[PDB]
Design a protein around this ligand. Structure first.
Ligand SMILES: *[C@@H]1O[C@H](CO)[C@@H](O)[C@H](O)[C@H]1NC(C)=O
Length: 248
């Protein structure tokens, strides 16, 4: 019985360029391809006959070119497939069904990231669902122009559901985040989502009481710097100076 060395793999049509399906078996006397329940012509087959290194048995290597027009013309229930069959003195053998699909990628995203307002300690999740296409598109994130790398920082990482997760604000500051769907046919960039990191201003501890001056009054100082109000963040609610009656 013949044993396959090289089996036909699942190939995709990029643009309109032909695909090659390599098939090799040992021992082989005759080798033919069967596409969608129909045999391929002998002239279309590119045969390669050679003697095996391990034992004195004939080895055959065959390759067929399948164009874009050949795939799209076949209309039915199941997808375009090509199975390689090998012959010998003992019997026949069947290889794995290699599925040939026309590669594509849509323009409209299923889900795009939106603008979010977050504080210094709180964490945010930026969701993204890439457009439909065969094979599925890989997801890459951009912080403004620069590519987001999850290996550089543990606080910034991309989940299995393509969403970007950030747990802090100083480790990932203010930036327009855009989701990029990457496929062999086309690269699709989503709309930029403005992520703003605000610092809510809270008062600093009270200073020491000043000496009792004239008109029986003494003041105390206060500052809005623990933490200081940055970006959109709200200012400190209260007074900068506190007056109290204390003398002669
Ligand atoms: C996003 O870019 C716009 C200009 O196109 C800018 O005005 C805005 O502040 C940016 N947002 C962030 C978070 O950088």
């Amino acid at each position: 019985l013949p044993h396959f060395l090289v089996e036909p793999e699942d190939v995709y049509i990029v643009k309109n360029k032909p695909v090659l399906l390599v098939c090799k078996a040992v021992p082989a006397t005759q080798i033919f391809f069967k596409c969608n329940g129909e045999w391929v012509r002998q002239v279309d087959h590119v045969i390669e006959r050679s003697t095996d290194g391990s034992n004195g048995l004939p080895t055959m290597e065959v390759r067929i070119n399948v164009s874009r027009q050949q795939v799209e013309k076949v209309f039915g229930l199941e997808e375009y497939w090509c199975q390689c069959v090998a012959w010998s003195s003992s019997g026949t053998t069947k290889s794995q069904k290699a599925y040939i699909r026309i590669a594509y990628l849509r323009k409209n995203f299923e889900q795009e990231p939106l603008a979010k307002e977050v504080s210094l300690e709180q964490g945010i999740v930026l969701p993204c669902r890439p457009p439909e296409g065969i094979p599925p598109a890989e997801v890459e994130w951009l912080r403004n122009e620069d590519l987001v790398d999850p290996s550089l920082d543990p606080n910034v990482y991309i989940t299995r559901e393509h969403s970007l997760v950030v747990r802090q604000a100083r480790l990932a500051d203010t930036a327009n985040y855009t989701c990029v769907a990457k496929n062999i046919v086309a690269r699709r960039r989503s709309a930029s989502a403005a992520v703003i990191v605000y610092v809510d201003g809270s008062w600093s501890p009270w200073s020491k009481w000043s000496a009792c001056g004239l008109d029986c009054t003494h003041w105390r100082s206060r500052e809005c710097s623990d933490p200081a109000p940055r970006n959109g963040g709200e200012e400190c609610q209260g007074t900068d100076l506190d007056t109290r009656n204390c003398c002669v």
